[PDB]
Design a protein around this nucleic acid. Structure first.
Ligand code: MG
Ligand code: ZN
Ligand code: ZN
Ligand code: ZN
Ligand code: ZN
Ligand code: ZN
Ligand code: ZN
Lengths: 103, 103
DNA sequence: GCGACGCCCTGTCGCTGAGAAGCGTTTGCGTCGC
DNA sequence: GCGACGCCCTGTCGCTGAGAAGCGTTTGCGTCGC
């Protein structure tokens, strides 16, 4: 029951995907089917999340919303999506979410 | 895709289950459907395996065949099945299988 | 001390259930003679 | 050094793919006045 992690090439990031990056946590649209869960805030919403490009990454641990990457790590989702070598904070061992920081 | 770990009470261990404990690795009967995998030797066979009674155990990591528990840990499967508090070597942190010992 | 109301940077954790498995290439050792 | 054949305690590792996710109870702070 692990969601397959697919690495999206930087050249295939579209303008609509960039525009649908969340700019405020309260503006999110929840969808139990088409939404994607942010690893940090654990909300399943339809705004664009990051895509970890580490081949050894798995599941949703690499998916971060606009506000969460902005506020918890000082990184922009738009920059991460256009970064060919971007690795998620869990991959880098620097994730400060409520679960990863006690561990 | 994790096999549910069910704790079998000692009072419900039957005579047939005891008799079907493997006494020699070469006598095992392989069955891809009704067999059970031994965590140590990773063979899926129909001989009786151990049942870890630690509630926090999960999956097949607690299932050990007769010869493997006998040879790798000096414990008898019959004694382990009749032990109300028996915990698998992975739970005890003493598993010496090819995977757990490099880790 | 517990939570209101402004401020600026517009924000977060709890809980359950989660945490592989098994086919394939798989079976000890020591002392010999290839 | 690589693998045969006896011995006794009758035996084991490699590899792929595996390694949660998301609903619920969820949103910063400081300084006030309850
Ligand atoms: Mg799973
Ligand atoms: Zn988030
Ligand atoms: Zn990652
Ligand atoms: Zn984390
Ligand atoms: Zn075994
Ligand atoms: Zn166990
Ligand atoms: Zn092990």
């Amino acid at each position: 029951m692990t969601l397959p992690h697919i690495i999206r090439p930087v050249e295939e990031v579209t303008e609509e995907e960039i525009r649908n990056i969340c700019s405020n946590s309260r503006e999110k649209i929840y969808n139990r089917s088409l939404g994607s869960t942010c690893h940090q805030c654990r909300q399943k919403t339809t705004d664009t999340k990051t895509n970890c490009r580490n081949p050894d990454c798995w599941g949703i641990r690499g998916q971060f919303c606009g506000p969460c990457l902005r506020n918890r790590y000082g990184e922009e989702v738009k920059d991460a999506l256009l970064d060919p070598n971007w690795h998620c904070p869990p991959c880098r061992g620097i994730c400060n979410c409520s679960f990863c920081r006690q561990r």
